[PDB]
Design a protein around this ligand. Structure first.
Ligand code: HEM
Length: 401
């Protein structure tokens, strides 16, 4: 609908929250596929441009850091191969198909307890009460920590992210260092405990992981854990809430899923495409190149706009329709290539198990009202801030009795 070129700052969180992004993306894909925003920041907005960049890390490097407004960090997403590959193989010990599928019972049980807390009410905030608690509880359990310790880790990772985005004065630098120290010392205390007396938790697995004769240091484990805390929490939340929102807005598709649970995996893929919780990841050019009509220079960052790519008309045909039967559905919500989301199968499992139970226990779930759901103004990961819903009450399972 945009008749004029978007005049936007792609580092401004409100761009991703005010609802104007998809029509801005439409203009970019049609007119200026590798777009430069009002500060000259380049962005790959078509599916082909995103995929080309992903397939060519030699040219589009991750070592400059994957944010535009934070320094590079010592975890795997800010590495190139071969370093990245080694680190990923080490951490992958925690995410084998065996270990993910072993979480089916615990995640299912977790989902039942969350729904138990709301089922008698006839209403809840789908974000606050269902979508937000689940991913963090799953990560907490995976790490083998107590709920109280989970919550400390959550607060620390929140403060670290905040600090990393702005530590200009002398004091924010120290608060940032204090927070890093607090988080590092807590996590290393846990690591030290598992080094002596191992469990089956993710800390123990990372401690024991060995690849090409190398093992992870305590600090490496601390930072890969931090990446998992950040990367696996709000992302999963936003696909759950935003994906469910679209199911609630398309009653025929909601009904189809209620009638046939085997349709759920296809539905989850469309929930992923539509929500695209990770709005962008940055790459740094290692050479000058002319890329989809734009002159890029060595050393500049470019944003890979995953939501923009996921609504590419040349690829999806009818991307502006939400359809649980979309097939094929080669969305890039999880990225593509060597950095393809390590947690993708765990995320898909959380999404499937929760939505299964929501369909079964809240079968007449509806939005309280059809107004658009408010979105988080963040330039990295974003989705619904709240989502009031209503449903016929039902009795809690209380499975531990
Ligand atoms: C809906 C949920 C999720 C989405 C949409 C998502 C999205 C992404 C994206 C876009 C990337 C970067 C890929 C690229 O640049 O090509 C990534 C990487 C990563 N994700 Fe996820 N993520 C999700 C859930 C999770 C979970 C649950 C975990 C772990 C428990 C996780 C851990 C990671 C890690 C460690 C990486 C770095 C992989 C690497 O650099 O090799 N993510 N994710």
């Amino acid at each position: 609908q945009m008749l004029t070129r978007p005049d936007v700052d792609l580092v401004n969180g409100m761009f991703y929250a005010d609802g104007g992004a998809r029509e801005a993306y439409r203009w970019m894909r049609a007119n200026e596929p590798v777009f430069r925003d009002r500060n000259g920041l380049a962005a790959a907005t078509t599916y082909q441009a995103v995929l080309d960049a992903e397939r060519n890390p030699e040219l589009f490097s991750s070592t400059g850091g994957i944010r535009p407004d934070q320094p590079g960090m010592p975890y795997m997403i800010d590495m190139d191969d071969p370093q990245h590959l080694l680190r990923r193989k080490l951490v992958n010990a925690g995410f084998t198909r065996k270990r993910v599928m072993d979480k089916v019972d615990s995640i299912g049980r977790l989902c039942d307890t969350l729904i138990d807390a709301v089922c008698e009410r006839g209403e809840c905030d789908f974000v606050r009460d269902i979508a937000a608690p689940l991913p963090m509880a799953v990560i907490g359990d995976m790490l083998g920590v107590l709920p109280t310790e989970r919550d400390m880790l959550l607060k620390w990772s929140d403060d670290l992210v905040c600090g990393l985005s702005s530590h200009v004065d002398e004091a924010a630098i120290q608060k940032l260092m204090d927070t890093f120290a607090a988080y590092t010392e807590f996590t290393k205390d846990v690591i030290t405990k598992r080094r002596a007396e191992p469990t089956d938790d993710l800390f123990s697995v990372l401690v024991n992981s060995e690849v090409e004769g190398q093992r992870m240091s305590d600090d490496e484990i601390v930072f890969e854990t931090l990446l998992i805390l950040i990367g696996g929490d709000e992302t999963t939340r936003h696909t759950l809430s935003g994906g469910t929102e679209q199911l609630l807005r398309h009653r025929d598709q909601w009904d189809a899923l209620v009638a046939d649970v085997d349709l759920l995996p296809g539905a989850i893929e469309e929930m992923l495409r539509w929500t695209s919780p990770v709005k962008n990841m940055c790459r740094t050019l290692t050479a000058d190149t002319v890329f989809h009509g734009t002159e890029l220079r060595a050393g500049e960052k470019i944003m890979l706009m995953f939501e923009s790519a996921n609504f590419d008309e040349s690829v999806f045909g009818d991307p502006d329709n939400f359809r649980i039967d979309r097939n094929p559905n080669s969305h890039v919500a999880f990225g593509f290539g060597t950095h393809f989301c390590l947690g993708n199968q765990l995320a898909r499992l959380e999404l499937r198990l929760m939505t299964e139970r929501v369909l079964r226990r809240l079968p007449d779930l509806r939005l309280a009202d059809d107004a658009p759901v408010p979105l988080r103004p963040a330039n990295f990961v974003s989705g619904p801030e709240s989502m009031p819903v209503v449903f016929t009450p039902s009795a809690p399972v209380l499975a531990h009795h």
